Design an enzyme around this catalytic site. Structure first.
Site, short mmCIF file in Angstrom:
data_model
loop_
_atom_site.label_atom_id
_atom_site.label_comp_id
_atom_site.label_asym_id
_atom_site.label_seq_id
_atom_site.Cartn_x
_atom_site.Cartn_y
_atom_site.Cartn_z
N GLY A 1 0.79 -1.21 0.00
CA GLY A 1 0.00 0.00 0.00
C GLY A 1 0.83 1.26 0.00
N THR A 2 0.09 2.38 0.10
CA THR A 2 0.67 3.67 -0.13
C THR A 2 0.57 4.46 1.12
OG1 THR A 2 0.11 3.62 -2.50
CG2 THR A 2 0.60 5.76 -1.52
N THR A 3 1.72 5.08 1.54
CA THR A 3 2.13 5.76 2.78
C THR A 3 1.13 6.53 3.56
OG1 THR A 3 4.40 6.06 1.98
CG2 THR A 3 3.69 7.43 3.82
N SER B 1 -2.76 1.82 5.51
CA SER B 1 -2.06 1.40 4.33
C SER B 1 -2.19 -0.09 4.13
CB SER B 1 -0.58 1.78 4.43
OG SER B 1 -0.42 3.19 4.46
#
Lengths: 243, 85, 41, 252, 245, 85, 250, 122, 272
Positions: free
Chosen positions: E30-32, E75
């Site tokens: 996932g993304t931060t 995330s």
């Protein structure tokens, strides 16, 4: 059946792989613990390691206050430690209402034990690996120290230790106890018990501790409290001026 | 081995080095139950060394115990026994 | 096989005691040893 | 050796124990004789290799002046009549002539195993080497001023016979360093590296758990790769904070 | 293989089963997201990746509320994250009715905690592939907690999870230490924007949209709001002066 | 040099000493002597020492034969080392 | 979403044997020594209390449990299995023979409930047998004194003496010889202590020894010296001091 | 009176702390010698003797320094004579450097023991 | 004073300071007095922790009685105090009963007296249905009869005992009676019968654990027969083993026993 590497049953050697591996990793929190009894009190001293400076120490505990008088030290991984804490605290609360009386160390012990043995048979549910040390200062038998292990086994102690330096602590305790020939410390005032405990710890793990490296909980008549940082510092200081 | 067989082996290894008046043989016999002569020899030899490094002429009942505890220590495990739990 | 063991164990007791002719006393004593070995496990 | 014992401080307990067992019998036999106990004759190292284990073995040789004699286990098997026997014997024979000397036998699991499924594929050659070793100890060949050190990764194929003293007496473990030990090992490794005048060892030490000496050295070097990146010779406390957390992330 | 790659019904010698190990990974893809604790509040921030021109701003936001004062950001996998907050919401709502109080942040943490622990002792119930960072302000003070696939939680001063977790925590411990805690809630938004920027280098192949939110006692007055408008634009601008990567 | 081995000692004595010393008396009884003895268990525990003590005491030669260094790798030396020994 | 599993964990093998039950027979063997002697004039049960840390205590452990007042039980096998089974067994005995009756349960009848429980756990998947074998020793007025054995399958048999735990056959063989016909309860205690001495080595103390008899019920065991209103215990544990006297007297 | 008793105790704790269990000198072994010599002047022999032993239950700074201090006190005793020769028997029996190795290659350990032989002869 | 602990203590010193007779008045006072827990054991006071202490006053008193020639009072005192214990805890009654027959024979006694106690004790055991203890008391009788040289009377009694151990309790007892049998025959000067009786003891001894001493008595007999059927050389190596065993035993083998074995090791060599 035909499976024992996907589900849990009796071994023909007779040593159950799931129980043995549960004996092994618990140490994944970098803990070492002991509990001793004084004449009137029961003290726990416990390690704390803080692995970041994005973390507060004061939310980091391995002692959970079950009721008002009962303490419990969990040595384990913390998601499993807490799972047991939630369950123990309600069963304790339920008992207290029903039976008009605060839960015994041994009875809490026994009840969580019998349940883990149930989960050990179960082929769809796993056992918690938690090692649970129940302590209090009961007035119907004095100070008491009772330890469970995930198996379903529990037995009464004179004082106990857990962690890989279990043997080293054991020896320190055996030596003291042989000498006095007593199964307790008879030192009046809790304070002198906490300090002694602290000395034997410093010997076993062979390092000097800090306020933020110990967490100390003491059980007293009809009340249980964890001790603060500032107080913990008083203990370390005072033993520096015996020699 | 039975209690009378064990007693000789402790005596014999101790003959060759220094001995104490404060020693008691009687403890050594209880502390090892039915452990082969290979094993018993092993503890006593270790103990005789540990003392000399600790700067002592005489081999006290405490030196013997510490050597027994070192050699039996191999449990990095927390809790022992699955034989009855 | 055991009967064979008894006869040679008996002989070893006479032999030690420096005699070449065996007795009932040696034969009982030898049997008693062999009997204990079957009682193990 | 290639390193000294100040070059690898923060293994302390293990340093102190090895000092007393190998150096000390050379310097005074005399104390062990008056007492009448035999002298120590064997040391065992187990632990994963080159985390501190290899480091100890070299470091001890240096201080005594002792001649390190390395045996490769697969040089002691060669495929001719009587060569395997000769190498182990010759090696010990020369250690006694030129003593003190250390025979460092790497992997006494290829040269003193005890099977697991009872094969003799090339595993009779295993018996030949183990046998030779026992003979010299058990005999009238005299080691006391001549020292033997075995190294093996995990102890699982050493006969009860070796664990009896006068073979191996002293069996040294590898644990993971103290907090106090991390601080000491960090001090030495960032000492030898160039740095900003203000530095904080302590900061790193808290974040690190489950590392061994080889892991602490890597953290010193990890910080420096980013300093080559940053077009300088100077680690900062700032490189180190990153370095330690990354080494930490990649493992337990 | 060891049989514990597809069973939760038995104990493993790693202290934990491989299928729990597999869920942790999904968190890292996932993304931060970060979380910044302040001396009056908490700040949440998230990276949302823009790949296509068709996306619409702030409706596909991965920041979700529980109640009106509790901020949750995660995330990893999207379906697992929504399921998680949806359970938290029911249990929170149950709390609100029963005790006639807003939920504590340490109470909400347990409430999730037992539900997340329960599906690792059961083989038939799937682990979460999200790590969720949550906190707010309550009647005990402000609190930042972060919850893992394990059922692990602890109290934080700063917290991070997602691809740039390492980089981000490194910058964060430095700033949180150099200040008392990252000063006040306003300051923290500019800093937060800088972290989301630095973190984009670990992801620089696709673009981002910086999306920030807060619940701060002294600068939002006990409610959770998204941080937007003039203030969000301002913060990107501040970042682009100092960092110019 | 080693004690506590009473049972194995007595055993060895009757096995090893007695047919060499008193060959005549076995054949006079008309029962088989012992001819081969097996020592099983780990060597070098005090085991080897009894062997060595009898060998000196009876004034017999001690011949130490490496069984495993017959383990030669051809038709050459090894099977002939056996003849001579 | 779970609790849909009921496939067995005890299956037939090609020798028609039962897998779990073979495994459990070992568990009993790895136990410690426990015995029973019925003298006709009572029942004596004794075991070794042993513990798994030196810092633990075996004085504050128990391996004989009261099932109902007049009946006590002992086992060989695994500690965890024994504790859950005793609890369930204590539950059914109260509910079904003191709410439906008021006389404390006849012995054999109590054995049949323990047996039913253990077999039930063997039939049904998601539970496995208990890994233990009991000697349940009791008294009832219409039976007299009694001794039953329950095997790990759930099978039972009466015996007038038996032994379990390490060196089971050899302990039992020793009893056959030393005790014949009918001899006293007192005398049978003297014998039981000797028999237990020969099994064990390295502990010989009365703080590691537990011997109990079912053989008398006194007002002192009734908790009141008034006019009786219930039978009360016929179970009595002999003291650590009491045990110690009798070891000297062998 | 009290002032000298404190000076011996207070300086001892500071001396052990200065030395540590890390180094030979860090103590000034001057302070150790100074303390011991002050004490002999200060009080009667039975008191001096009791104190010197009580200190030795600690580390005692080094095995060689203890032996130096013991041996000085021993000469003062033999000099004082009468009932004091008897009191030397007590002092010599408590210490463990003359009867157990601690680094027994000194001429002095052996020498105190020779005096004990002379007292015994008489 | 009026205290069990003080009055035990006073009494013990009182023999030495003054006389046995002054001490004896104290000792009876203890029996007669001092309320303790549970049922009586003197009938006028109640006793259990006092009765335990009273046993140590009994042994001390009993030592003095054999010198005084109150041996005759002792003979009465031991049967009489059986029933004292009988009233309370059973366990105490076993221990004390066996210990007391031993206490009398511990110190030098008239044989006639010693016999009369042993027979009555066996009778007290009969009232009950113990046979564990009662097989044991009959050993003590056999041994005394033999010393008196009523060898036939020992022979008859030992035969019945032999049949009991080979289908009933007490395996270690067997070894002791075989040795004793040998002593009965050896003295009557029947070399054959004793020599087979001794083989039976050796066989028995090695089946099972036996006490250090019991074996060591067996080698003493083995040495004796090898002097009567000659070859002293072998008789010495047996006395050597017996003498070593007695040494490690210390004073827990008798002064006089130790002496006879040292005598026989020296003597054997002179004959050789």
């Amino acid at each position: 059946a035909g499976y024992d590497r996907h589900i849990t049953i009796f071994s023909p050697e007779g040593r159950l792989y799931q129980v043995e591996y549960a004996f092994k990793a618990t140490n994944q929190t970098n803990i070492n613990s002991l509990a001793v009894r004084g004449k009137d009190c029961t003290v726990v001293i416990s390690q704390k390691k803080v692995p970041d400076k994005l973390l507060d120490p004061t939310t980091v505990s391995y002692i959970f206050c079950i009721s008002r008088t009962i303490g419990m030290v969990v040595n384990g991984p913390i998601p499993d430690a807490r799972n047991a804490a939630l369950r123990a605290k309600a069963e304790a609360a339920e008992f207290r209402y029903k039976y008009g009386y605060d839960m015994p160390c041994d009875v809490l012990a026994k009840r969580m034990a019998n349940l883990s043995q149930i989960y050990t048979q179960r082929a769809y549910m796993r056992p918690l690996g938690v090692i649970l040390t129940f302590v209090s200062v009961d007035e119907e038998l004095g100070p008491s120290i009772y330890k469970t292990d995930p198996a379903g086994y529990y037995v009464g102690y004179k004082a106990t230790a857990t962690g890989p330096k279990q043997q080293e602590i054991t020896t320190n305790l055996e030596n003291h106890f042989k000498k006095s020939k007593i199964d307790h410390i008879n030192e009046e005032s809790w304070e002198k018990v906490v300090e002694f405990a602290i000395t034997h710890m410093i010997d076993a793990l062979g390092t000097e501790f800090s306020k933020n490296d110990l967490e100390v909980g003491v059980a007293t008549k009809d009340k249980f409290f964890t001790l603060s940082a500032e107080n913990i510092e008083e203990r370390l200081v005072a033993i520096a001026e015996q020699d | 081995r039975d209690r009378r067989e064990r007693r000789l082996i402790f005596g014999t290894i101790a003959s060759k080095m220094s001995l104490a008046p404060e020693a008691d043989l009687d403890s050594l016999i209880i502390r090892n139950d039915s452990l082969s002569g290979a094993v018993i020899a092993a503890i006593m030899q270790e103990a005789g060394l540990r003392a000399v490094r600790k700067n002592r002429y005489v081999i006290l009942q405490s030196d013997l115990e510490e050597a027994y505890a070192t050699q039996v220590k191999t449990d990095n495990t927390v809790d022992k026994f699955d034989f009855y739990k | 096989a055991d009967v064979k063991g008894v006869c040679t164990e008996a002989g070893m007791y006479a032999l030690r005691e420096r005699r070449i002719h065996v007795t009932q006393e040696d034969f009982e004593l030898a049997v008693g040893k062999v009997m204990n070995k079957n009682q193990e496990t | 050796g290639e390193i000294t014992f100040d070059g690898i401080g923060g293994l302390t307990e293990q340093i102190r124990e090895l000092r007393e067992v190998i150096e000390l019998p050379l310097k005074n036999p005399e104390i062990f004789q008056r007492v009448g106990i035999k002298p120590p004759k064997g040391v065992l190292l187990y632990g994963p290799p080159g985390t501190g284990k290899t480091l100890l073995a070299k470091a001890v040789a240096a201080t005594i002046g002792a001649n390190f004699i390395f045996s490769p286990a697969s040089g002691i098997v060669d495929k001719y009549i009587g060569e395997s026997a000769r190498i182990i014997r010759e090696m010990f024979a020369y250690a006694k002539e030129h003593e003190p000397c250390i025979i460092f036998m790497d992997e006494v699991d290829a040269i003193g195993g005890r099977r697991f499924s009872e094969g003799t594929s090339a595993d009779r050659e295993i018996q030949r080497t183990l046998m030779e070793l026992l003979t010299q100890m058990d005999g009238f060949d005299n080691l006391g001023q001549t020292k033997i050190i075995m190294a093996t990764n995990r102890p699982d194929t050493l006969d009860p016979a070796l664990l009896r003293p006068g073979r191996l007496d002293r069996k040294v473990e590898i644990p993971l360093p103290n907090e106090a030990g991390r601080l000491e090992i960090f001090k030495i490794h960032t000492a030898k590296v160039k740095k900003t005048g203000e530095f904080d060892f302590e900061a790193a030490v808290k974040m690190s758990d489950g590392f061994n000496g080889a892991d602490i050295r890597n953290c010193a070097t990890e910080a420096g790769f980013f300093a080559i990146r940053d077009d300088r010779d100077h680690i900062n406390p700032d490189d180190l904070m990153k370095a330690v957390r990354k080494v930490a992330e990649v493992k337990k | 293989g060891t049989g514990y790659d597809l069973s939760n019904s038995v104990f493993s010698p790693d202290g934990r089963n491989f299928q729990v190990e597999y869920a942790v990974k999904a968190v890292e893809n996932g993304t931060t997201s970060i979380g910044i604790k302040c001396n009056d509040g908490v700040v949440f921030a998230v990276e949302k990746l823009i790949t296509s021109k068709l996306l619409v701003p702030q409706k596909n936001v991965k920041i979700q509320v529980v109640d009106r004062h509790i901020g949750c950001v995660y995330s990893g996998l999207i379906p697992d994250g929504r399921h998680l907050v949806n359970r938290g919401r029911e249990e929170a709502a149950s709390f609100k009715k029963l005790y006639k109080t807003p939920i504590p942040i340490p109470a909400f943490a347990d409430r999730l905690g037992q539900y997340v622990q329960a599906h690792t002792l059961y083989n038939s119930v799937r682990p979460f592939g999200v790590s969720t960072i949550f906190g707010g302000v309550d009647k005990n003070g402000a609190h930042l907690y972060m919850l893992e696939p394990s059922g692990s939680y602890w109290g934080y001063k700063g917290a991070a999870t997602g691809k740039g977790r390492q980089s981000a925590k490194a910058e964060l411990e430095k700033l949180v230490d150099h200040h008392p805690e990252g000063l006040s809630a306003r300051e923290a938004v500019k800093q937060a924007a800088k972290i989301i920027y630095l973190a984009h280098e670990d992801n620089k192949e696709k673009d981002f949209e910086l999306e920030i939110s807060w619940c701060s006692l002294s600068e939002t007055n006990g409610l959770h709001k998204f941080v937007k408008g003039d203030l969000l634009q301002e913060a990107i601008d501040f970042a682009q002066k100092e960092i110019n990567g | 040099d080693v004690g506590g081995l009473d049972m194995q000692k007595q055993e060895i004595r009757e096995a090893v000493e007695l047919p060499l010393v008193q060959a005549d008396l076995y054949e006079q009884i008309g029962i088989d002597p012992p001819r081969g003895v097996l020592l099983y268990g780990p060597p070098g525990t005090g085991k080897t020492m009894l062997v060595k003590a009898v060998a000196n005491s009876t004034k017999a030669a001690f011949i130490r034969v490496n069984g495993s260094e017959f383990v030669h790798k051809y038709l050459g030396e090894g099977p002939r080392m056996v003849r001579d020994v | 979403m779970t609790d849909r599993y009921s496939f067995s964990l005890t299956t037939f093998s090609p020798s028609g044997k039962l897998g779990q039950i073979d495994y459990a027979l070992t568990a009993v063997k790895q136990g410690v020594t426990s015995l029973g002697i019925k003298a006709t004039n009572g029942v004596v049960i004794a075991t070794e209390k042993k513990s798994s840390s030196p810092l633990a205590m075996s004085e504050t452990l128990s391996k004989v449990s009261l099932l109902t007042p007049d009946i006590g039980a002992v086992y060989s096998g695994m500690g965890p299995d024994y504790r859950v089974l005793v609890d369930k067994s204590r539950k059914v005995a109260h509910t079904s023979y003191k709410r439906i009756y008021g006389e404390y349960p006849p012995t054999k009848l109590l054995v049949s409930e323990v047996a039913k429980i253990m077999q039930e756990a063997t039939q049904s998947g998601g539970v496995r047998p208990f890994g233990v074998s009991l000697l349940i020793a009791g008294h009832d007025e219409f039976n007299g004194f009694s001794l039953y054995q329950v095997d790990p399958s759930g099978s039972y048999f009466p015996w007038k003496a038996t032994a379990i735990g390490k060196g089971s056959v050899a302990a039992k063989t020793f009893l056959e010889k030393r005790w014949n016909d009918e001899l006293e309860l007192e005398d049978a205690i003297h014998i039981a202590l000797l028999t237990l001495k020969e099994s064990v080595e390295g502990e010989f103390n009365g703080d590691t020894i537990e011997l109990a008899i079912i053989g008398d019920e006194n007002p002192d065991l009734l908790g009141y010296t008034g006019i009786p209103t219930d039978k009360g215990p016929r179970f009595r544990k002999l003291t650590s001091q009491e045990i110690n006297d009798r070891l000297e007297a062998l | 009176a009290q002032n000298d008793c404190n000076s011996a105790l207070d300086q001892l704790l500071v001396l052990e702390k200065k030395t540590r269990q890390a180094s030979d000198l860090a103590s000034s072994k001057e302070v150790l010698a100074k303390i011991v010599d002050l004490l002999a002047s200060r009080n009667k022999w039975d008191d001096l003797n009791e104190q010197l032993t009580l200190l030795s239950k600690k580390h005692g700074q080094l095995k060689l320094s203890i032996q130096y201090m013991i041996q000085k006190v021993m000469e003062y005793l033999k000099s004082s004579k009468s009932l004091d020769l008897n009191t030397r028997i007590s002092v010599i029996e408590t210490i463990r450097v003359v009867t157990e190795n601690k680094i027994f290659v000194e001429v002095e350990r052996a020498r105190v023991t020779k005096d004990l032989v002379e007292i015994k002869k008489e | 004073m009026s205290l069990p602990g003080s009055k035990l203590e006073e009494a013990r010193r009182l023999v030495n300071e003054k006389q046995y007779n002054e001490a004896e008045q104290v000792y009876l006072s203890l029996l007669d007095k001092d309320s303790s827990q549970s049922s009586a054991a003197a009938g006028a006071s109640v006793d259990d922790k006092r009765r335990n202490e009273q046993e140590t006053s009994i042994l001390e008193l009993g030592q003095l009685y054999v010198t005084m020639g109150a041996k005759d009072k002792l003979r009465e005192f031991i049967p009489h105090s059986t029933e004292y214990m009988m009233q309370f805890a059973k366990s105490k009654t076993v221990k004390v009963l066996k210990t007391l027959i031993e206490k009398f024979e511990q110190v030098p006694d008239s044989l006639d007296d010693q016999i009369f106690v042993c027979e009555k004790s066996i009778e007290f055991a009969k009232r009950e249905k113990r046979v564990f203890l009662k097989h044991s008391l009959s050993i003590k009788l056999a041994t005394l009869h033999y010393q008196k040289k009523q060898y036939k009377d020992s022979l008859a009694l030992i035969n019945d005992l032999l049949r009991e151990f080979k289908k009933l309790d007490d395996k270690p007892s067997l070894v002791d009676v075989h040795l004793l049998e040998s002593k009965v025959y050896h003295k009557l000067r029947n070399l054959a019968k004793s020599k087979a009786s001794l083989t039976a003891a050796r066989t028995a001894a090695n089946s099972i654990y036996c006490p250090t001493q019991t074996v060591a008595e067996l080698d003493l007999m083995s040495g004796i027969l090898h002097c009567e059927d000659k070859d002293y050389k072998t008789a010495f190596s047996y006395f050597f083993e017996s003498f070593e065993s007695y040494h490690n035993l210390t004073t827990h083998n008798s002064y006089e026993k130790a002496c006879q074995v040292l005598k026989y090791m020296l003597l054997s060599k002179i004959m050789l």
